[PDB]
């Protein structure tokens, strides 16, 4: 109630520095093709050729990128390719955005700092998927009371679980006021140890 973690800026211009969600977000891998040799460090993948397909975290490919593609170029995973961008248009209420994740909107908004050609078509997928999956999170979260919700929440990602936990915290708080139950003073964080 007073532990206010630093929130995630993974949807705006640039992720926050201290947010433990973005730190684990950017760690996810991404495919690149190198433009030069990689001397003195070919141990991991001593030198590495130019024109080689490698898998690197996102944070690494932040500074190793330039406009001229001096060191390496990037190509998007298939989840954001043209293939799946039609699937997410058929009916977005069917996809398991936890397997295709578990950071869909967080990752996809950082792949816009690579000035690829099809950006005007990724920032339209996300917008049209989130709008598609809305009337199923506005209604399965404000209307699921004293139920086992661990199956209404099995196909969501970190940007959506944060909302499914705000619908419930406002349902279970009006239903606790209606029953004269939110008058008793209780232990706040000690019942967490118990």
């Amino acid at each position: 109630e007073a532990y206010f973690r630093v929130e995630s800026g993974a949807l705006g211009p640039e992720e926050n520095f201290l947010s433990l969600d973005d730190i684990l977000m950017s760690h996810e891998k991404l495919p690149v093709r190198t433009e030069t040799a990689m001397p003195r460090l070919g141990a991991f993948f001593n030198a590495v050729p130019q024109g080689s397909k490698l898998e690197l975290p996102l944070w690494l490919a932040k500074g190793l990128f330039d406009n001229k593609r001096r060191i390496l170029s990037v190509e998007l995973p298939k989840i954001y390719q043209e293939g799946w961008r039609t699937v997410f248009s058929a009916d977005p209420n069917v996809v398991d955005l936890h397997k295709m994740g578990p950071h869909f909107y967080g990752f996809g908004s950082q792949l816009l700092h690579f000035d690829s050609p099809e950006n005007a078509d990724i920032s339209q997928s996300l917008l049209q998927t989130f709008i598609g999956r809305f009337r199923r999170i506005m209604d399965s979260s404000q209307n699921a009371y004293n139920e086992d919700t661990s199956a209404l929440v099995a196909r969501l990602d970190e940007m959506e679980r944060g909302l499914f936990q705000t619908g419930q915290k406002g349902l279970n708080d009006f239903q606790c006021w209606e029953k004269g139950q939110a008058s008793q003073i209780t232990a706040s964080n000690l019942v967490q140890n118990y």
């Binding site: 298939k78 799946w84 699937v87 248009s89 058929a90 009916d91 209420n93 069917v94």
Partner: protein, 608 residues
Amino acid sequence: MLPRSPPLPRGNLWELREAQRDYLDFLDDEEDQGIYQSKVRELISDNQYRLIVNVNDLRRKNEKRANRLLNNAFEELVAFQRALKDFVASIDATYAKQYEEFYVGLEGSFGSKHVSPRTLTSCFLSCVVCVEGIVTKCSLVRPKVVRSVHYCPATKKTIERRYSDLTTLVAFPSSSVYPTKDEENNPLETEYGLSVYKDHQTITIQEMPEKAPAGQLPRSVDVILDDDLVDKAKPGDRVQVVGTYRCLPGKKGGYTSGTFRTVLIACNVKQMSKDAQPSFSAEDIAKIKKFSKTRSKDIFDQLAKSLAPSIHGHDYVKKAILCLLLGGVERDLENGSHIRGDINILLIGDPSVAKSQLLRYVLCTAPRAIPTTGRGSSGVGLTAAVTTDQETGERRLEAGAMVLADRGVVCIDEFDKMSDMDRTAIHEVMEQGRVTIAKAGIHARLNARCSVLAAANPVYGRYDQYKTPMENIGLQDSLLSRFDLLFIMLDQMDPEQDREISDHVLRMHRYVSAAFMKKYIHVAKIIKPVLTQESATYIAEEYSRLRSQDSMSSDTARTSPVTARTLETLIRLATAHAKARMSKTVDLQDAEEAVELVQYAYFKKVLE
């Protein structure tokens, strides 16, 4: 894993007037990129009834119609197939009359419709669905009338009649009375040549085994194929039918039970598994014609080195197994004779020399390979056995192992734990190439042109290196002639070899291209080289030197007898060595590549 599209989305790169006038506008397709005007013409040049559509396009073009088509499939598919005949008459009206009616399949990505026969509830009635699963039966293809043409011999007129049943998209039950006197005065007579019939089948999809909750008997569903979709599915497949869902009522005696039977009126079929590798790229064929030209000296050896890297030693055996994977050339003379074009390999040796490994690799490399053991295989269960049916009760001939694997490979491990009465059932199917059965009420001859790869443990448990090669093998000299290559994988206890063997296996436990031999041999198989008189006089000499005992050696025993049957195994190994080079003419460098193999595989040495 959820199949939310017939095209696997991961790696695809490597009144009723509005509907009819919107479908036509969609089928124009000219002004944006001409995607369908490139397909209507394409099918007219192939004489097809139906064309496959992508609903993914209908969405981008018009969302309202794309939604109204996945929820009222009948009234929309009777308007699609009308405004398709309309658009084919707008190209070639002469063609637009050859066929009674056109059809239109579907494919793409339906939102929640991708269901299994287990999830197909009764909220999908009259809605395009896309069912996946295994076919587990078929029906007998039968005609079904859709129009008659009658004739009056008295009045010289000609009346017609249009038919319709509950398996249409319009569903009016017409009676098949076949009018014989429309007006009581004149008599009629049907004309079958001018009427119109169509085909009709009925298959049964069943839920996939590894998707069932395993507690029950997995659910099923009934499909009604039609109009040249008919034979597109055999029992044991993995199909993705895309068809409307329908309930068909009935009444026995003016009193109907509410219970109905629901079927799926298919309008497309897709085999999910890709079961061939002919789709080589032009870049691939370019690579192939490069590699086949680079060096003609060392391409066979270079091919065989890369065969099974997971195994150390046994270069000769890999060479011969490659020769197997290629094959010879089956000559059939003019009078009707026939000479086989396959190679049958036998491997004997002490335990743990990677024999089973070579077998399990040859299984996966070649297409159409069948495995078999030496005790889980009877002499009749290998070739063909007589049985009956449960529905009809009349006998038939169930095909054994070595008849399913036609034009393929059969891998028999522990070929020695097979009783004497069971080997004998092979002597006809290993050389003559076809099985003959004369049982009680069955007289048949099945084609079984295949090739045998067999592995046998020697007698005495281990190969006593002192007795002789003939006493270590139990096979009689009649079966030993069929197998044209006998490899004694002798195991030796010198300390050196074990060192590198351990190095190799341990490196393997710390983890030419692999997926290129597939295409390369699938291509070089078809070539049919022809002998030349420069080598044909060299083989006709190496054989007559093999057949003479004196020229062999002393202190050297014979593993198998040299007959006039090893002569045309020389010829087979040769024209299978000039198939890697894609050469098309065998030369003296071939008829010498295939003689040392023999010189090594035939004669063994005895110690004391």
